[PDB]
């Protein structure tokens, strides 16, 4: 049966039933869900100014101007002088002029009409400052800011990189059938890869127990029994009671060792070839 | 009994007798299953090798998946075959020893001096030992006669990947694994360790396959994905 994907819900939008040219029944179910902007959503402009929403501010806390207009989006000035996008400010001024005048604005390259000077003069004629700046009061304290702030009507776009589709966390769950390690994929309950470079960072900090916790205790830990003479892996059967060796039978003593299961798999598949790896044991407790 | 730790790993070449004695069953039949009867005796899916579905007990050991390590099988090859990964080594075992008496074609006294030096410097200066053994191999390959048995030796050229064609005064003869194994069985232990090998753990004729190990199911599990027939793996 077809089930809804894990970690996402919605409302069934459409159900369609038809036939696929041979009498076979074909059923399609379309499910919709509502996405409201939040912290982490990505927005962009027509000048290369992507970024995520850092916080959402109400109308009362926004810095209103002398006419009561509050911004819809606030953009940091420090992003302008390095990227050198003068077209951003030019579009802001042009959009404010277009909204004030109701006249069309054409921004085709090399043939822009009207020019900036005409637009600024018309903006001044319509009750606003020519440089597109405004007197702004603080919405939280009511104190007038000592400087004037630039306002515009830049056009924004919302991209399909929403935070609601990017979270994935795993505590415990299914493991691989072969390596007995956590699975992969957001829909498969998750699992994050701990690569070599993170291991190098941990070594550089010199934290041995943290390395053991990250790489052994939380993935493919196992206990295996090794014969004391041949060095191969034995087992411990439930017939009555026995430590049994594949070659020595019952004439050898077996010891248990904790080890990554991937290492045991490596040993087993090395014995699949003609290589014979014999494990030499040692005392857990250091005498002296 | 005490809980221990892994202190070292000793490698080597797995002996055919050791393969025979570590195995639990001998694979005789050639059909993987009959009427979906995977427990068919003598097949690759024999239950004695291991268990992978949740509810089952291994015939060899009364344990489930939680405590059942895989069990190995053995296949008795009727015609010897050569290991593709070891060919280079046996190549150096063919051009540096006599075909008849199975001895290095370097005279006695200097060979004894060389082995004394090698044993005296083997562990302290591994790079020097490697240089010494490579020099010995080079000066033994370039000899066309065996001082020990007084016989004239021909030369062997390697052809990829695994076929050796020796020249015997014309009419190049293709070599068979059986005679190669017979030739390599005659090399003494004192002379095989001089070339940088271990006689007690890596014997050259064990490098020629007569018995093949069969990995357990736990290494090659059957996948029943796509909600259809189970899809076996390549092994």
């Amino acid at each position: 049966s077809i089930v809804t994907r894990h970690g996402e819900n919605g409302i069934v939008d459409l159900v369609l039933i038809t036939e696929t040219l041979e009498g076979n029944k074909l059923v399609k179910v379309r499910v919709r869900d509502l996405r409201i902007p939040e912290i982490g959503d990505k927005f962009a402009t027509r000048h290369g100014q992507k970024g995520v929403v850092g916080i959402l501010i109400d109308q009362v806390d926004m810095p209103y101007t002398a006419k009561g207009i509050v911004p819809d989006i606030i953009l940091n000035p420090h992003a302008l002088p390095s990227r050198m996008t003068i077209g951003q400010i030019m579009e802001a001024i042009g959009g404010k002029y277009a909204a004030l005048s109701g006249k069309p604005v054409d921004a085709t390259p090399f043939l822009e009409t009207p020019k900036l000077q005409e637009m600024q003069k018309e903006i001044l004629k319509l009750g606003h400052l020519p440089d597109s700046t405004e007197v702004v009061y603080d919405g939280r304290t009511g104190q007038k800011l000592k400087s004037r702030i630039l306002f515009g009507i830049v056009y924004y776009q919302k991209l399909h990189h929403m935070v609601a589709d990017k979270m994935h966390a795993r505590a415990r769950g299914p493991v691989q059938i072969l390596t007995r390690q956590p699975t992969e994929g957001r829909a498969r309950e998750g699992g994050l890869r701990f690569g070599e470079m993170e291991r190098d960072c941990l070594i550089g900090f010199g934290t041995a127990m943290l390395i053991k916790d990250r790489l052994l205790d939380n993935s493919d830990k196992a206990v295996v029994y090794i014969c004391d003479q041949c060095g191969y892996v034995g087992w411990y059967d439930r017939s009555k009671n026995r430590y049994v060796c594949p070659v020595h039978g019952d004439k050898s003593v077996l010891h248990p060792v904790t080890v990554s299961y991937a290492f045991k798999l490596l040993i087993q598949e090395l014995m699949s070839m003609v290589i014979s790896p014999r494990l030499i044991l040692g005392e857990k407790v250091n005498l002296g | 009994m005490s809980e221990k730790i892994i202190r070292g790993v000793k490698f080597g070449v797995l002996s055919p007798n050791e393969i025979r004695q570590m195995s639990v069953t001998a694979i005789i039949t050639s059909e993987v299953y009959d009427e979906d009867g995977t427990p068919i005796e003598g097949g690759v899916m024999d239950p004695k090798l291991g268990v992978i579905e949740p509810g089952q007990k291994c015939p060899v050991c009364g344990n489930t998946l939680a405590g059942c390590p895989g069990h190995f099988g053995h296949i008795e090859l009727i015609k010897p075959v050569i290991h593709i990964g070891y060919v280079k080594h046996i190549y150096d075992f063919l051009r540096s020893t006599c075909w008849r008496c199975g001895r290095i074609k370097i005279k006695e006294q200097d060979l004894e001096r060389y082995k004394r030096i090698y044993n005296a410097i083997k562990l302290r200066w591994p790079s020097a030992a490697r240089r010494l053994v490579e020099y010995i191999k080079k000066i033994s390959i370039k000899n066309l006669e065996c001082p020990h048995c007084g016989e004239k030796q021909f030369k062997i050229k390697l052809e990829k990947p695994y076929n050796f064609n020796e020249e015997r005064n014309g009419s190049i003869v293709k070599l068979s694994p059986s005679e190669i194994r017979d030739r390599l069985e005659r090399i003494p232990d004192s002379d095989v360790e001089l070339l940088g090998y271990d006689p007690k753990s890596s014997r050259p004729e064990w490098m020629i396959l007569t018995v093949l190990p069969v990995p357990p199911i736990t290494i090659r599990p059957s996948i029943t994905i796509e909600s259809g027939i189970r899809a076996e793996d390549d092994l």
Binding site: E283, K284, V285, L287 | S2, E3
Partner: peptide, 7 residues
């Protein structure tokens, strides 16, 4: 837990 007992 180990002993390493000897006589």
């Amino acid at each position: 837990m180990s002993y390493s007992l000897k006589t």
